[PDB]
């Protein structure tokens, strides 16, 4: 019982200098536990039949004791999950943590699984966004030649999104988080083989400190800040990161005129929307996420971290600003000049990752004479 | 009553459910052409509530004065959704306009 709880926590060697950017791993663990705990309690009152799904959710928020806080904690917790996910990935790119190939690639799988999980959860209340989100996203599969359409109808359990869809989605959404938990434990096991990277990108074996009490207390402090952010949202602005259209029950005959994705999917939606071709947009969407698996092969710098690399830093923040641009564009109508800004931002995204950054890496190497 | 003031009241509070001219279409409410001198619920082609059809009074300046002050009170069960016009003068003006417009 002791060991592996311990030598896997208590006396785990850790760099003496990891910064707050290293707090997101434990914050993601906490977001996962939060979602699982609030999720199970919501599932104790939720019913997946299309005639009663939306109703069961209002019953939770209106009549179940504290049902409203559990619900908005689950909704806003999903948002916190993504904020942390994006900070976590950003930390990895900036500091070259991706060189831990197994840990990194498992991480890419984790990002995709959380996205799929959050997607399905959003469908459960069966409001307007639920219904059209289910329709659009499952249809991404229709871009697959020969069987695409068949795969979609098979997923739906029919010729359109209906009862069979909602009921299986409740089942998928229910189990996936536990699968995510098992995948995350594997994520950590591979990390433990190497231990953590640090802001300098330089091996920290000459200066390790025990995880307890240094990072246990630092992680607790981080956890408190996460809870503050979550509760500011739940108690003072529970709908801020939500969409008013989902307070309207699903209507299969009418897609809201200003329909837009959940904020954490806006950058990817902007990219897909920028290509006036079905298959092309779907491939660009898939690639906007999967390209993360290519980062390790695109590393040209002789140094692991961007800490000592000025040019790479500038390009890194341009990428972040660009994702911010795509997020903004994803929230705007498909009209001029947004159509062009979005296309440029989409091109700039792939250009920074595939060309500009690897190039900055080589130039910096030359400037240092190696 | 002042016919011009009544026209303004009709346009703002009645027109959306009633036409007054001969041949005017029925809408949420019945066309009102020929209103004065006719019994309640007798405009052909409109589905009145039994409450309205059974009131049994004759529309005129007097009955309209009371009805328009509080429709539901005068005809319990009516499906006409209108709170009523409180001011006596406003009702007088509106009725003066109706007397003219529903007879031209």
């Amino acid at each position: 019982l002791m060991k592996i709880v311990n030598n896997a926590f208590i006396d785990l060697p850790a760099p003496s200098n990891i910064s707050s950017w290293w707090n997101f791993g434990s914050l993601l663990g906490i977001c996962l536990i939060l979602q699982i705990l609030t999720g199970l309690f919501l599932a104790m009152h939720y019913t997946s039949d299309t005639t009663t799904a939306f109703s069961s959710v209002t019953h939770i928020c209106r009549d179940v004791n504290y049902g409203w806080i559990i619900r908005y904690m689950h909704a806003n917790g999903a948002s916190m999950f993504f904020i942390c996910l994006y900070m976590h990935v950003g930390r990895g790119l900036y500091y070259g943590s991706y060189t831990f190939l197994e840990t990194w690639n498992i991480g890419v799988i984790l990002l995709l699984t959380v996205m799929a999980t959050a997607f399905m959860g959003y469908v459960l209340p069966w409001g307007q966004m639920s219904f059209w989100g289910a329709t659009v996203i499952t249809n991404l599969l229709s871009a697959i030649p020969y069987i695409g359409t068949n795969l979609v109808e098979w997923i739906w359990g029919g010729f359109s999104v209906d009862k069979a869809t909602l009921t299986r989605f409740f089942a998928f959404h229910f189990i996936l988080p536990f699968i995510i938990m098992a995948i995350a434990m594997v994520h950590l096991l591979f990390l433990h083989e190497t231990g953590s990277n640090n802001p300098t990108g330089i091996s920290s074996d000459v200066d390790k400190i025990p995880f307890h009490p240094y990072y246990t207390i630092k992680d607790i402090l981080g956890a408190l800040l996460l809870i503050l952010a979550l509760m500011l949202l739940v108690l003072f602005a529970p709908d801020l990161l939500g969409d008013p259209d989902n307070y309207t029950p699903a209507n299969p005959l009418n897609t809201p005129p200003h329909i837009k994705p959940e904020w954490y999917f806006l950058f990817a939606y902007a990219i897909l929307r920028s290509i006036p071709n079905k298959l092309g947009g779907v491939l660009a969407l898939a690639f906007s996420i999967l390209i993360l698996a290519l980062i390790p092969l695109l590393h040209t710098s002789k140094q692991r971290s961007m800490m000592f690399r000025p040019l790479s830093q500038c390009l890194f923040w341009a990428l972040v600003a660009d994702l911010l641009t795509l997020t903004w564009i994803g929230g705007q109508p498909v009209e001029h000049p947004y159509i062009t800004i979005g296309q440029l931002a989409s091109v700039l995204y792939f250009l920074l990752i595939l060309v500009l950054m690897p190039t900055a890496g080589t130039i910096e190497n030359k400037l240092l004479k190696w | 009553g002042d016919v011009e003031k009544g026209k303004k009241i009709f346009v703002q509070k009645c027109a959306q459910c009633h036409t007054v001219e001969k041949g005017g279409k029925h809408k949420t409410g019945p066309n009102l052409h020929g209103l004065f001198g006719r019994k309640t619920g007798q405009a052909p082609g409109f589905s009145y509530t039994d409450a309205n059809k059974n009131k049994g009074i004759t529309w005129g300046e007097e009955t309209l004065m009371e009805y328009l002050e509080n429709p539901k009170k005068y005809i319990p069960g009516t499906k006409m959704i209108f709170a009523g016009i409180k001011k006596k003068g406003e009702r007088e003006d509106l009725i003066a306009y109706l007397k003219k417009a529903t007879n031209e």
């Binding site: - | 959306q16 809408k27 949420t28 499906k79 709170a83």
Partner: protein, 96 residues
């Protein structure tokens, strides 16, 4: 809903339990809509059954102005002016 539409020239009065959370602008939107009916501007002619309301999307709504001074009497004697009635129903809708 079919019966509702039939009773309202084809338009559907939506359920109001969540109207404030189901509309951008919430009560600011609902208050503005209720107190913002006005004449169509020059060059705009609406089909019968529709009313001009600058705050409704497209500006043509199937709901006739529902409130006005003295539309009801309050239990506490508060003067029932259109704006007062609008302000209180909106507060109630927020709670709902």
């Amino acid at each position: 809903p079919e019966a509702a539409r039939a009773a309202n020239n084809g338009a559907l009065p939506p359920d109001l339990s969540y109207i404030v959370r189901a509309r951008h602008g919430g009560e600011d939107y609902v208050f503005s809509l209720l107190t913002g009916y006005c004449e169509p501007p020059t060059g705009v002619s609406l089909r019968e059954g529709l009313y001009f309301n600058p705050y409704f999307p497209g500006q043509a709504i199937g709901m006739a102005p529902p409130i006005y001074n003295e539309v009801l009497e309050f239990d506490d004697g508060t003067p029932a002016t259109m704006s007062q009635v609008a302000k209180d129903v909106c507060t109630f809708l927020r709670w709902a």
